[PDB]
Amino acid sequence: MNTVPFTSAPIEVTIGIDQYSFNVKENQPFHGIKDIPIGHVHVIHFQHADNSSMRYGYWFDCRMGNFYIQYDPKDGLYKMMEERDGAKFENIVHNFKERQMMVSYPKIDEDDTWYNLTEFVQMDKIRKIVRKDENQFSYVDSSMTTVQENELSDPAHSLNYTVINFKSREAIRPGHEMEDFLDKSYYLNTVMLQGIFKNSSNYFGELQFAFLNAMFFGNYGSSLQWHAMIELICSSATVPKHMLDKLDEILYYQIKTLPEQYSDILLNERVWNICLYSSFQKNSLHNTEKIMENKYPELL
Amino acid sequence: GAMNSSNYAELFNNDIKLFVDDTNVYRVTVHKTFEGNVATKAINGCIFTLNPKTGHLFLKIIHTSVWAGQKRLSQLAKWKTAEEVSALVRSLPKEEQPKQIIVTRKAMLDPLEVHMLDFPNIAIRPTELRLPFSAAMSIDKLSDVVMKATEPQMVLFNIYDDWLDRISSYTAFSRLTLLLRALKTNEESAKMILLSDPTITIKSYHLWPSFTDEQWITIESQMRDLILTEYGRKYNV
Numbered sequence: 001m002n003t004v005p006f007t008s009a010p011i012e013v014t015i016g017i018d019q020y021s022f023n024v025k026e027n028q029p030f031h032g033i034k035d036i037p038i039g040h041v042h043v044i045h046f047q048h049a050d051n052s053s054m055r056y057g058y059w060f061d062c063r064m065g066n067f068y069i070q071y072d073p074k075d076g077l078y079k080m081m082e083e084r085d086g087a088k089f090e091n092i093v094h095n096f097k098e099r100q101m102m103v104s105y106p107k108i109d110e111d112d113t114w115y116n117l118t119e120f121v122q123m124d125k126i127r128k129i130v131r132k133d134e135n136q137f138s139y140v141d142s143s144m145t146t147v148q149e150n151e152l153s154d155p156a157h158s159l160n161y162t163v164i165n166f167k168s169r170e171a172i173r174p175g176h177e178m179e180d181f182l183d184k185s186y187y188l189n190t191v192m193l194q195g196i197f198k199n200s201s202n203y204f205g206e207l208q209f210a211f212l213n214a215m216f217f218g219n220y221g222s223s224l225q226w227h228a229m230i231e232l233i234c235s236s237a238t239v240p241k242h243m244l245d246k247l248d249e250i251l252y253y254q255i256k257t258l259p260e261q262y263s264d265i266l267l268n269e270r271v272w273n274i275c276l277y278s279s280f281q282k283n284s285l286h287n288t289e290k291i292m293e294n295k296y297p298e299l300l
Numbered sequence: 301g302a303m304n305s306s307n308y309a310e311l312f313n314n315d316i317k318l319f320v321d322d323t324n325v326y327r328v329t330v331h332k333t334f335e336g337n338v339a340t341k342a343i344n345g346c347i348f349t350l351n352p353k354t355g356h357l358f359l360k361i362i363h364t365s366v367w368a369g370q371k372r373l374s375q376l377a378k379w380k381t382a383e384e385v386s387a388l389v390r391s392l393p394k395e396e397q398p399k400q401i402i403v404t405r406k407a408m409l410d411p412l413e414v415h416m417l418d419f420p421n422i423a424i425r426p427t428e429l430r431l432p433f434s435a436a437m438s439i440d441k442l443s444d445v446v447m448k449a450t451e452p453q454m455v456l457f458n459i460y461d462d463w464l465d466r467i468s469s470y471t472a473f474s475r476l477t478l479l480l481r482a483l484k485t486n487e488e489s490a491k492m493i494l495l496s497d498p499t500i501t502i503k504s505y506h507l508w509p510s511f512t513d514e515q516w517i518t519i520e521s522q523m524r525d526l527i528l529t530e531y532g533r534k535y536n537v
């Protein structure tokens with residue numbers, strides 16, 4: 001069980017750690033988060049009280065280094081940093097733990113939600129989507145745009161999601177125009193899975209990471225990418241059976257975790273009604289269809 | 301964006317453009333079977349591809365053999381249209397290729413866009429207008445060439461005959477649309493108007509009669525009356 005200590009909390013802020021969150025008041029004696037489960041990526045995110053504009057945060061894996069948070073009063077945010085001095089870190093954490101100034105990662109033992117939302121997400125792939133190679137952790141915020149978005153403006157601050165475009169030469173073989181547009185299996189299986197992602201685990205990892213950025217940061221281009229990767233599977237007549245079963249589990253937990261009062265902006269009516277009711281895979285997502293119909297029947 | 305009343309004069313400017321209408325591509329007759337069920341029998345169609353500035357009509361005849369053994373024909377028909385429109389542009393030298401293609405039905409947009417991915421500088425546009433191009437099969441010579449075709453075939457027509465010698469392309473296009481609207485609203489009356497007078501002929505190579513200017517005004521007025529009338533006889537007004 002690992003720890004992300006805080007130097008201090010000089011400004012009042014809601015702090016998220018994965019699917020949890022808690023309020024910290026200005027200059028409250030708060031010195032971070034303990035008992036973080038090892039084996040999963042994590043995100044720690046921030047919404048200042050004064051400016052609910054800009055949710056931001058840091059994807060990290062405590063196996064990759066000792067990380068702490070320190071507010072920067074110049075740039076005006078809570079920044080993640082790595083401590084290279086291992087004994088300085090242990091000693092600081094130990095003191096904060098002795099004075100009980102850390103909140104405990106509040107994982108219920110029956111609860112596999114986080115695992116289920118991050119099953120295929122790996123830091124190494126996150127870092128290729130979020131290029132900032134001098135750090136072991138990755139910064140994301142609400143306003144960052146995606147590479148595909150920029151083709152339609154700062155390259156360094158972009159989300160490098162895999163570009164998916166159904167009306168593109170990559171997606172449509174010369175001479176198979178109708179076939180490939182109405183049945184995207186070629187594009188799913190050969191172009192993307194075999195060509196680009198290499199396997200379905202990497203595909204599902206990007207899809208899960210896009211959902212998490214949409215949900216935690218309201219990042220619009222991430223939400224576009226999540227829906228695009230769902231629609232490409234659902235619009236393919238030929239999908240490995242194991243991928244269909246897993247997709248159903250993946251979306252089930254995403255739908256289960258979504259805040260009830262964010263569904264209107266985070267869920268695309270057209271995509272979901274098509275996937276659940278018109279697409280090739282309309283009969284293959286039993287768990288997702290049941291939770292969607294019981295929780296958001298208005299969207300449909 | 302969409303072509304509508306507000307940007308109608310763009311059709312007569314010097315950017316090459318084509319209208320594409322697919323309403324006659326997939327044509328059937330519906331009949332009873334011996335068992336009392338219903339079946340369709342396809343008949344020959346055509347794609348109506350028209351340069352509204354010049355009058356050039358690239359009439360691609362869709363022979364019934366293209367539907368043999370295929371499923372979802374109304375959907376195929378849109379993609380067949382798009383495939384045929386794309387090889388026409390490819391066939392054309394660059395300076396003769398369109399800058400825009402306007403489809404008369406919105407369901408043609410994605411089929412044509414996908415088949416034209418190789419031509420990113422050709423804009424595919426819908427229209428808000430309710431153009432009467434479906435009535436092209438009420439022009440006898442066009443109907444005759446479609447029905448007689450025994451194989452796929454491209455037949456070239458100037459749908460303005462020689463009118464551009466005397467009127468502008470704005471006026472020609474407005475004449476054409478009026479004739480086609482009339483034919484679409486009451487084909488029998490429309491045709492009586494055009495061919496009542498035995499002395500006015502259709503010279504072999506033209507589609508419409510050789511009206512004088514004054515005679516075209518009489519005709520044009522008689523077609524407007526027909527269209528107001530049938531609107532009454534339909535709406536009781």
Ligand SMILES: CONC(=O)Cc1ccccc1C
Nearest residue numbers: 354355356357358456457458
């Ligand atoms: C103006 O470009 N038109 C063509 O490429 C051939 C054609 C088609 C129909 C009627 C006449 C002609 C010359």
